[PDB]
Design an enzyme around this catalytic site. Structure first.
Site, PDB file in Angstrom:
ATOM      1  N   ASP A 115       0.855  -1.183   0.000  1.00 60.29           N
ATOM      2  CA  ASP A 115       0.000   0.000   0.000  1.00 60.29           C
ATOM      3  C   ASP A 115       0.888   1.229   0.000  1.00 60.29           C
ATOM      4  OD1 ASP A 115      -2.704   1.397   0.307  1.00 60.29           O
ATOM      5  OD2 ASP A 115      -1.638   2.160   2.061  1.00 60.29           O
TER       6      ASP A 115
ATOM      7  N   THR B 203      -3.744   5.659  -1.788  1.00 62.72           N
ATOM      8  CA  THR B 203      -2.378   5.726  -1.309  1.00 62.72           C
ATOM      9  C   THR B 203      -1.510   4.751  -2.065  1.00 62.72           C
ATOM     10  OG1 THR B 203      -2.799   4.055   0.386  1.00 62.72           O
ATOM     11  CG2 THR B 203      -3.197   6.346   0.956  1.00 62.72           C
ATOM     12  N   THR B 204      -2.057   3.575  -2.356  1.00 63.04           N
ATOM     13  CA  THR B 204      -1.490   2.675  -3.341  1.00 63.04           C
ATOM     14  C   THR B 204      -1.338   3.363  -4.687  1.00 63.04           C
ATOM     15  OG1 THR B 204      -1.727   0.467  -4.282  1.00 63.04           O
ATOM     16  CG2 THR B 204      -3.644   1.856  -4.196  1.00 63.04           C
TER      17      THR B 204
ATOM     18  N   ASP C 240      -8.677  -2.711   3.605  1.00 64.36           N
ATOM     19  CA  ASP C 240      -8.806  -1.411   2.961  1.00 64.36           C
ATOM     20  C   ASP C 240      -9.825  -1.422   1.835  1.00 64.36           C
ATOM     21  OD1 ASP C 240      -6.968  -0.387   4.669  1.00 64.36           O
ATOM     22  OD2 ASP C 240      -5.288  -0.442   3.254  1.00 64.36           O
TER      23      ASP C 240
END
Lengths: 510, 514, 513
Positions: free
Chosen positions: B48, B81-82, B382
């Site tokens: 991530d 965010t990845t 997530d």
């Protein structure tokens, strides 16, 4: 990085170059460590203890690598060995070999997922024709030669020389004694090495083999209420005084006298707690022992935690220090508890053998433990190579014959499939020759000779190599037809488990 | 130690690329895993953006600063965010090019914003309002998990995901802090991903065979001491008063056989039979002989519970909490239509399951119990927040760059200001958008150029949202494909990308001192 | 030996290309400066001409080879665009290098360049209009032509004399001037000045009071193999060897002199009458004081020191024939100069042969007290004329001063090439390479290049108003308005050399050493 930043020891060169080589050197070690071989690898312990093994995990456990590359994968061979016997020495080298084809593909510039999947794709394809490679199955787990045919392999897959009587004595150990129907016990089957006699003299005593001295009179009864104690007698006396001997003098003569009947008390309370045998992780106490000779309680002067473990394990025992009159918690399990002499040493024996609680404890005679250990290495595997817990193991060719079978197959498919997927699927069926190259060395020939014929033998599920002169020129053995076979099972695992990491271990550049 | 202005901005922008670049597949199924053995010095596995940041001890302020604001999205979405880091430095790439040619660092930072809007306006314009069904969420589930793991791995995961949130959509709670109950299990393979609409009970009772299958679950979550303790304990404990110890020996098991009878009667009140299952769960130790009395009554009387589990027990079952079992109505204890007390390995993990009115849904995974077993747990979790956003936003658009060009198009297709001034910012701004598909497509395949002119002309020809085949490098209609951006996710990281990129463009010195 | 491979084989190429190219941006347009290159002569050359400084002294590079190749022809073809031909490829390359820096083929990125130049050449053909041979129309060009070549005040001060040179053409077919360039140089009290004279002038004359000042009927005897000899078309030998030989040699010279002056004077006697018509012998060596005097009292105008090239334009101006002797001659070979005059400005005696029967020539008397002045102010003349002549040589001309620049870039529509990005990328560095012309001009002034440039587009992004950097102020202007216009030969040809040499870069994927 360029910056001061983050955390990685892989990536760039490392991922491509150095991890693959971290994915190389030890596989390079395992190459003649697996399969029929005369290779031998010395090892010293944390004991600094000189020992030789072609088994990995032994070597592996003491190997540290800054990379996870070499590091992480070895769990698979363990994850493998968690499942079975050897083939584990094959697991990693299968990965490492097929791996470094990808760094070539990286030189050829093939994308990770492009490199990744064709194996995975063909990893099925292996598992898909893998049953087509079932040339037999396991008939009588009671039969010796039914089983010995197999057991020879992991031993062979460990080492070439001693495999036969081992494969015999291990079924003569009666892997028979369990259904192995889903019920099989290597706690009830233990390899207990007598240092002494020969290893051809090594026996298997069904029932717990404890080379530990049977102390004093034997068990009260053979269904032994067992008191397993870490420290049942630490001594009942404290001599601290004016001189810690005498100051008021007669105060001495109390306790050295008053100590022993407390050991009697304890020992009588061993007879009072009801233990038909008391077991001392700590020392024996002679008066106590003498009392335990009066009370005829079988005893063990000293007990390894290993002893105490299996003791605590199988008896339902609990090893405890006791400065008190003892309490049976440990109680009994084993319904016959004996003294044997094998290699002519007192063998504390515990046998309840129910075919389910059934204890067949391999008792290794031999004049060297390192001997009986690298032995026990292959012996570790054979039993649990025997342990599939399919009575019908769908016996597949031993020794690696199935390799070349799918070398043609899956690369012929690898041919058929298109794209960059090809070499992915194509390199896949190329991963076999590694050991046919590896053992071909210790056999004494090049692998082309091997593989061209291992190719020219085409579809066999027999013709194969190892450490042999048959493995030299002919590139032909019977790694099926001779009695060397393999369970269908670990195959699937030795195939699958390594394929996963080889895929996965590259994808991480961190 | 100091670096000024231009020299200040380099260390900033220079630090981004390599850092940024590692993530060039962190997103979609093409995303490549990354292993820390180095983060604390421990073997691990992660993909991530924000997480990998915090995971590694990350020495550079550049690496340091976004992780703080990258924490926001990973807090919000959990992914992207990845993603977000990729546009950010590419954006940093753009602005310098002016200042490289020369231009005032202000106006470029200045020209990002109407750009940050007109593109965000395009978000309003592009955002695809979708009516969420489990299937839509299934492909929402797999687009975040493809970002995480195998689409293969996304599969068994997807079920529990869209199903757990399925019962919280009942609750009409757009967010999930419940049905986030997750479980890991001893297995050879992390493949197993299990879904318990109820809970799973870690602790087993020290007495097995109490009620091993509790069909009707009547759960009193009990702090109660049914182990007060059996022998000399004074207040329940040892002390320096014999006088009190002399009085306090007997009432112990009395206070216990009280709570024994308080359960005994309770059981037979709750049941009158061992047929209907029954459960007692102590937050503390219980006497086994209490249990022995109770284990033979048809109860499974459990001990040393974790106060957290008590809640989801008290809640998902509608369970209850007392210090005295007394008797309570059978219904007075919360319920799970079945309870399955389950040992895999050596520990019975009791499934209190279909807990009546579940607010919590338990996701078991069986695995090798490695950071593998971790790399799955984080993966779904997530996506959970991601798919949770699809509950939040009715607008979910596809990913795989189907957005980017069409968004990057307009503001480039026309100067949104028709200022060079803003377009200075904008051309800098609107350009960085393309980083995601163009590397992923080329990560998976052919040069960005084709797919770009494809996806652009395609969108230009289509206006349908077409996106990479993330393991090929060819654009495919990404809506139908199922790789999908919450209008939550993409919009935020958009803001996140730019909102940081400005004042960090504005660091015209850094002194090492403090 | 040493082989440079791949991006290493690429780097120093584009590195020595763009950087040295970047060295040169002080120039190109009146907002550009002069650039000082001191050659091995210790000469001070302050120049805005790109063609100049390439060959003179350039830091050693393999790249210094092809650059000297292309911009040569650029001065050869147009005479301008040379200061221009520098700044295109680096921009093109710096932009193109990205795609290669992004890992795309110099091969494919080549192919967008080639594809894009068409529509600009098309655009050049499109955006041009015929800008007539009218001097004033050429002034605006000559004004601007020398500007891209040199400083405004120098670009301006020649523009007067410049188009006048190309104005006297006979319907000469050249893109440049040959004979309209007659370079006279005088050490002056004005650094920048040029005396523009129609037709040929002779480097030096011979003045005598009896020698006629302005000869309207001038029978031109071109002269050679001088008075030191006696009726000879071959130059004889001398003995100065011994101090005695020097004495006995120079006395007979009088008789050798006497013959020719005689042969001269009676040649006037035939054709001119006695003194009745003016007459001119042009003695392209010295004129010996007797015959200097004796031809003068004759009525002949005897001219000292005309060059062999002065000899060449001499008999064409008067429409006559040259003679290597001083001697009696068929009258036809005497050229009739409707004017022979001799003008002495300071030391130099400028023979004016005027009313040239072929006004193929005019004369530019270059002024400066200082070499670098005399050097440079000559330089602007030489390129600009060649450039400016294109304005008359081509009735078509095309706007300068950036007006057209942002247009093709706007019109290029890079996505319109859809084929790969072979074209679609190579067109991108192209519109970039287009706009370096406004860049440096918007650059060299205040603001930025873009800051004004981005106006220029957004300005001409309002389409049909052809706007560019106002040449000096680095800020917008419409170049079509004032007439600031770069030659139809300037702008059309320029892209050709630009596209090919940057391609030559891309076709070199390896350099061995």
């Amino acid at each position: 990085m360029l910056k001061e930043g983050a955390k990685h020891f892989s990536g760039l060169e490392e991922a491509v170059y150095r991890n693959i080589q971290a994915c190389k050197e030890l596989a390079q070690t395992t190459r003649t460590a697996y399969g029929p071989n005369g290779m031998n690898k010395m090892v010293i312990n944390h004991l600094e203890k000189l020992f030789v093994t072609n088994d990995a995990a032994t070597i592996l456990r003491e190997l540290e690598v800054q990379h996870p590359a070499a590091k992480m994968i070895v769990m698979a061979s363990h994850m493998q060995e968690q499942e079975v016997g050897d083939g584990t020495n094959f697991v990693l080298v299968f990965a490492g070999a097929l791996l470094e084809l990808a760094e070539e593909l990286l030189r050829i510039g093939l994308s990770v997922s492009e490199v990744i999947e064709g194996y995975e794709i063909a990893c099925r394809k292996a598992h898909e024709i893998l049953p087509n490679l079932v040339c037999c199955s396991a008939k009588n787990l009671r039969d010796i030669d039914e089983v010995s045919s197999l057991l020879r392999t992991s031993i062979m897959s460990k080492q070439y020389g001693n495999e036969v009587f081992l494969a015999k004595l291990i079924a003569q150990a009666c892997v028979s004694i369990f259904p192995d129907s889903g019920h099989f016990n290597v706690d009830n089957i233990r390899v207990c090495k007598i240092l002494g006699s020969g290893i051809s003299s090594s026996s298997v005593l069904h029932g717990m083999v404890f080379k530990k001295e049977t102390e004093g009179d034997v068990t009260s009864v053979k269904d032994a209420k067992i008191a397993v104690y870490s420290c049942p007698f630490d001594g009942m006396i404290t001599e601290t005084k004016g001189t810690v001997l005498i100051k008021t003098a007669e105060e001495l003569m109390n306790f050295s006298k008053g100590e022993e009947n407390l050991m009697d008390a304890q020992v009588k309370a061993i007879a009072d707690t009801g233990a038909n045998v008391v077991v001392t992780g700590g020392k024996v106490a002679d008066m106590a022992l003498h009392y335990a000779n009066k009370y005829n309680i079988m005893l063990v002067r000293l007990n390894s935690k290993w002893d105490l473990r299996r003791l605590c394990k199988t008896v339902g025992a609990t090893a405890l220090p006791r400065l008190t009159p003892p309490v049976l918690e440990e109680m009994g399990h084993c319904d016959s508890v004996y003294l044997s002499e094998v290699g002519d040493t007192q063998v504390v024996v515990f046998k309840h053998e129910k075919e389910d609680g059934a204890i067949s404890t391999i008792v290794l005679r031999g004049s060297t433990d390192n001997l009986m250990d690298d032995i026990e290495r292959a012996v570790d595997d054979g039993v649990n190579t025997f342990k599939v817990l399919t009575r019908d193991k769908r016996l597949v060719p031993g020794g690696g014959a199935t390799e070349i079978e799918l070398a043609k197959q899956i690369t012929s498919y690898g041919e058929t499939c298109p794209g960059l997927e090809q070499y992915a699927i194509k390199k896949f069926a190329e991963a076999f020759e590694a050991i046919p190259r590896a053992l071909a060395e210790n056999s004494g020939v090049k692998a082309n000779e091997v593989i061209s014929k291992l190719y020219a033998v085409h579809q066999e599920g027999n013709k194969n190599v190892g450490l042999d002169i048959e493995a030299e020129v002919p590139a032909v053995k019977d790694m099926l037809e001779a009695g060397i076979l393999d369970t269908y099972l670990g195959k699937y695992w030795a195939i699958k488990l390594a394929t996963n990491a080889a895929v996965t271990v590259l994808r991480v550049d961190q | 130690e100091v670096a000024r202005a231009q020299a200040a901005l380099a260390v900033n922008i220079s630090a981004a690329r390599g850092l940024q670049d590692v993530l060039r597949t962190n997103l979609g199924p093409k995303g490549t895993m990354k292993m820390l053995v180095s983060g604390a010095g421990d073997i691990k596995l992660t993909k991530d953006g924000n997480v990998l940041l915090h995971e590694m001890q990350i020495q550079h302020p550049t690496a340091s600063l976004i992780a703080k604001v990258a924490t926001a999205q990973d807090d919000i979405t959990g992914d992207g965010t990845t993603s977000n880091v990729l546009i950010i430095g590419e954006l940093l790439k753009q602005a310098d090019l002016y200042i490289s040619e020369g231009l005032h660092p202000r106006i470029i930072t200045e020209g990002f914003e109407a750009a940050k809007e007109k593109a965000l306006q395009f978000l309003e314009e592009v955002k695809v309002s979708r009516e969420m069904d489990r299937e839509t969420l299934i492909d929402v589930a797999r687009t975040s998990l493809r970002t995480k793991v195998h689409a293969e791995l996304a599969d068994v995961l997807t079920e529990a995901v869209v199903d757990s949130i399925l019962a919280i959509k009942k609750q009409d709670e757009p967010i999930d802090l419940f049905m986030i109950e997750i479980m890991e299990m001893k297995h050879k393979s992390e493949t197993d991903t299990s879904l318990i609409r109820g809970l799973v009970l870690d602790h087993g009772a020290r007495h097995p065979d109490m009620k091993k299958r509790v069909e009707d679950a009547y759960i009193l979550t009990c702090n109660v001491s049914l182990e007060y303790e059996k022998t000399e304990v004074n207040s329940g404990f040892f002390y320096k008063s014999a006088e009190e110890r002399e009085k306090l020996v007997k009432a112990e098991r009395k206070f216990i056989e009280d709570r024994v009878k308080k359960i005994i009667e309770l059981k037979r009140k709750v049941c009158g039979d061992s047929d209907k299952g029954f459960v007692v769960i102590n937050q503390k130790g219980i006497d086994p002989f209490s249990l022995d009395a109770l284990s033979k009554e048809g109860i499974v009387a459990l001990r040393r519970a974790k106060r957290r589990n008590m809640e989801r027990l008290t809640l998902a079952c509608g369970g209850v909490a007392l210090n005295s079992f007394d008797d309570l109505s059978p219904d007075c204890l919360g319920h799970a239509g079945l309870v399955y007390e389950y040992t895999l390995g050596e520990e019975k993990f009791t499934f209190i399951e279909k807990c009546n009115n579940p607010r919590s849904v338990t996701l078991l995974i069986k695995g090798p119990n490695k950071h593998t077993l971790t790399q799955i747990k984080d993966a779904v979790r997530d996506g959970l927040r991601a798919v949770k956003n699809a509950i939040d936003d009715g607008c979910v658009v596809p990913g795989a760059g189907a957005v980017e060009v069409a968004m990057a198009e307009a503001l480039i297709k026309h100067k949104p200001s028709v200022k060079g001034r803003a377009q200075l910012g904008v051309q800098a701004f609107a350009d960085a958008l393309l980083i995601i598909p163009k590397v992923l497509a080329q990560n998976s395949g052919f040069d960005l150029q084709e797919t770009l002119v494809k996806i652009q002309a395609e969108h230009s020809e289509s206006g349908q949202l077409v996106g990479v085949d993330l393991n090929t490098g060819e654009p495919m209609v990404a809506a139908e494909v199922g790789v999908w951006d919450n209008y939550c996710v993409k919009k935020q990281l958009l803001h996140s990308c730019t909102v940081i990129a400005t004042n960090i463009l504005l660091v015209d010195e850094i002194m090492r001192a403090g």
